[PDB]
A paper describes a structure:
DnrK is a canonical S-adenosyl-L-methionine (SAM)-dependent methyltransferase that catalyzes 4-O-methylation in daunorubicin biosynthesis. Recent studies have uncovered that DnrK is bifunctional and catalyzes additional 10-decarboxylation as a moonlighting activity. Here we have taken advantage of the natural diversity of anthracycline methyltransferases and employed extensive chimeragenesis to probe factors that govern catalysis and substrate recognition.
Next the chimeric pair DnrK RTTD and DnrK RTTR was constructed to examine the influence of the sugar-binding regions R2 and R3 from TamK, an enzyme with higher affinity towards 4 than RdmB. Both DnrK RTTD and DnrK RTTR became exceptional generalist enzymes, with the ability to use any of the substrates to catalyze reactions, yielding all potential products albeit at different yields. The presence of R1 from RdmB in both chimeras shifted the reactivity from 4-O-methylation towards 10-hydroxylation, with less than 15% of the native DnrK activity measured, compared to almost 60% 10-hydroxylation conversion. Structures of DnrK RTTD and DnrK RTTR in complex with 1 revealed the molecular basis for the expanded substrate specificity. The mutations introduced by chimeragenesis have altered the hydrogen bonding network between the R2 and R3 interface. This structural change allows stabilization of the substrate via hydrogen bonding interactions between R163 and the 6-hydroxyl group of 1. As an example, DnrK RTTD and RTTR differ only in one amino acid, K190 and N190, respectively, that is located in R4.
Author numbering:
A (entry chain B): 15 to 353
B (entry chain A): 14 to 354
Write the structure that this text describes.
């Protein structure tokens, strides 16, 4: 009972079985004809006796079901492992792609709790970003995973802010540019600038080009720690401050405050857990612990945000309620920061 | 969507690694010894306090810890199983510095085990499983410790599932510490027993039986069970031995046992024998089977697979004795009685 619950919680074979099914494109090969284990083994280049033992666990956890003897089809949850599903969960669990490869850092979590520093380098030889720049195949798969989420996740944050009295918007860490794209559709009178670093600056140009927004959202390069090149009535920090330590985040916040036009606002799009609420913490701590072992960053509660804001001459005006997006598991918040 | 959260939870590595880190840090033991605040726990575990609190946050979410009083954390009923003195020994079984949990890192390369059917332990640690233990005394001793705790209780029910009245001598191939032989001696004082075991791991046998007060009537012989067995016996026992080996090697050990079988004797296999369609619990069975694959290239075998191996060794499965329930042991076992065909 309690012995069963503890063993299930500390089991490594179940999450590795799921990641193996995704890496082998198992669900894809089933939908495309391969019904028997003999055909599934041939298409995945695996030994049939071993694949059946993996399927046996996949059946026991509800990702596959036996429909007629020997024929295995995916369940409704197992259908998410199809490569063309909108949630892209197969790519997120592919051990050859960036995120699931990086999740191996969790096998050294005791070191991360001892030091507070990431363990990615201790497994792959280089830190997270240096390894991406040296493996273009991995940098591409990471850029892809970010773009699949950015194409839909910003309609709700865009709707949670009034843009009538806004002239220009600067998105620091503009990423692919999905947020700036969502602001353009919501408020066509606003001009947007995506400010990115030397690396991601060109993944933003190509994304807004393919959206038909090249003439509507400018993309400039820059460094977040130097003075900002332009002023804006609204500066956006969407999932950027969680990558930097505390002493570097107040600098980015200070530069934003400095470049903030009169009456403007700084918008922080991230999590802001409150100790009292009964909100789901599963996805939040997943992201938080990922930040620890990947880069050393961290999430921040609403109380810590007040400390960061006050240190940048800013004040947290208001946290706009839970932002829900169709295929985005983690609900987010919008923080409004005034001087 | 509920399916999106169900799939992400099943495929998550942060939850099981948080449990193993808590076990490795002896977190629950330090709480029960006075340290309830984070600053006290960080001092006793030699960790960074801000990082420790983030690990505690996941532990309370998954119900292993609870925040009774502000800033003070206490283990739940499930969390109390990570205390080191707990009879199930789950803290040692999740300790990343000890043999079993260290070997579970082999799961990170499970796709290679499905492509080749051979273990992945060597690709993580440089040497195969047993060769790595024989070379790291700290690890072999921790491995011996995990088995010995289980061998102290898991053999009363299997011993009671067999009639020893007409048995004169019992040979236990792969006799482990010697728990099965110790359970038979207490149940049938008229039985002499010999424990057979390979190099290095015979050392754990003589001291366990001595500490059981049975050093008199349980012999211990060092040998290799791919060679002719040291003697004949009315009952030859294979308690969780064959699952460590592939099919061709298991048939050879089975063939050596059939060669040393006295007239009228029986070979007893103590392991699992699931029947496809039984509908019995398969959480503990799949874990052990997949562990055997990545650890050593072994496997569990179904009732039908057992019929094939027995026939290849000149044997027939006469009886399969029902689910054996042993205290603090999550996996019910079985006793297959084999006779010459
Ligand atoms: C380097 C790592 C990185 O920071 C990359 C990038 O910064 C990013 C991450 C996380 C999230 C979002 C990001 O853009 C994001 O936009 C978002 C959102 O709109 C709505 C809900 C959750 C999220 C969310 O959890 C981080 C990550 O772990 O990616 C695998
Ligand atoms: C590496 C160690 C080894 O492969 C071989 C080792 O001998 C052994 C194992 C497993 C079991 C028993 C063992 O003795 C055992 O006695 C037993 C029992 O009496 C009653 C129920 C279950 C079990 C059981 O699952 C394997 C293992 O991986 O440990 C979990």
């Amino acid at each position: 009972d309690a012995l069963r619950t503890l063993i299930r919680l500390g089991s490594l074979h179940t999450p590795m079985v799921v990641r193996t099914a995704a890496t082998l494109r198992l669900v894809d090969h089933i939908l495309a004809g391969a019904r028997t284990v003999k055909a599934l083994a041939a298409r995945t280049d695996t030994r049939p006796e071993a694949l059946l033992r993996l399927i046996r666990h996949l059946v026991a956890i509800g990702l596959l079901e036996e429909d007629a003897p020997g024929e295995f089809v995916p369940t409704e949850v197992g259908e998410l492992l199809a490569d063309d599903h909108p949630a892209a969960q197969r790519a997120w669990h592919d051990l050859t792609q960036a995120v699931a490869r990086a999740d191996i850092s969790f096998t050294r979590l005791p070191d991360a709790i001892r030091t507070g520093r990431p363990t990615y380098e201790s497994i792959y030889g280089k830190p997270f970003y240096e390894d991406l720049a040296g493996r273009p195949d991995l940098r591409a798969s990471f850029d892809s995973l970010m773009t699949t989420r950015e194409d839909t996740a910003f309609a709700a944050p865009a709707a949670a802010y009034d843009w009538t009295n806004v002239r220009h918007v600067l998105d620091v860490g503009g990423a692919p540019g999905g947020f700036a794209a969502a602001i353009a559709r919501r408020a066509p009178h606003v001009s947007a600038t995506v400010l990115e670093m030397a690396g991601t600056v060109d993944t933003a140009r190509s994304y807004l080009k393919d959206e038909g927004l090249s003439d509507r959202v400018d993309v400039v390069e820059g460094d977040f720690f130097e003075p900002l090149p332009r002023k804006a009535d609204a500066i956006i920090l969407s999932f950027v401050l969680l990558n930097w330590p505390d002493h570097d985040a107040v600098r980015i916040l200070t530069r934003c405050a400095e470049a903030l036009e009169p009456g403007g606002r700084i918008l922080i799009h991230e999590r802001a857990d409150v100790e009292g609420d009964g909100a789901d913490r599963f996805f939040s701590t997943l992201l938080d612990l990922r930040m620890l072992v990947f880069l050393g960053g961290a999430l921040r509660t609403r109380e810590k945000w007040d400390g960061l804001a006050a240190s940048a001459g800013l004040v947290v005006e208001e946290v706009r309620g839970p932002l829900v997006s169709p295929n985005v598991p983690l609900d987010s918040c919008l923080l409004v920061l005034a001087p």
